[PDB]
């Protein structure tokens, strides 16, 4: 079964790589979201302020 164990270890490594690739892809997406939030709070900051001058 060492041959099977070896085959599986090799396949598991590719799985680890896909996993890491998926998180990295998940990271950029979170980056887009977070800053995306930082864009809304901007308007939402002065918006309540513009109301004040109304």
Return the CA Rg of the chain. 24
* Count of domains forming the chain: 1
CA 44 – CA 41 distance, rounded (Å): 5
| 22-to-5, 12, 27 alpha-carbon distances in Å | 25, 15, 9
> For residue 17, what are the CA distances in angstroms to 1, 24, 39?
24, 10, 33
Q: What is the 3-state secondary structure (H, E, C) of 12-34?
A: HHHHHHHHHHHHHHHHHHHHHHH
Measured CA to CA, the distance from residue 11 to residue 15 in angstroms comes to 6
CATH of the domain at 21: 1.20.5.110
Residues in the chain: 54
Which experimental approach was used here?
A: X-ray
Which residue carries 């918006």 as its tokens?
A: 47
Tokens 């109304």 found at:
54
**Per-residue buried b or exposed e for 5-14, using 16+ beta carbons within 10 Å of the residue's own CB:** eeeeeeeeee
C-alpha span between 20 and 41 (Å, rounded): 32
Resolution in A: 2.3
Domain residues for 21?
1-54
């Amino acid at each position: 079964s060492t041959r099977r164990i070896l085959g599986l270890a090799i396949e598991s490594q590719d799985a680890g790589i896909k996993t890491i690739t998926m998180l990295d892809e998940q990271k950029e997406q979170l980056n887009r979201i977070e800053e995306g939030l930082d864009q809304i709070n901007k308007d939402m900051r002065e918006t309540e302020k513009t109301l004040t001058e109304l």
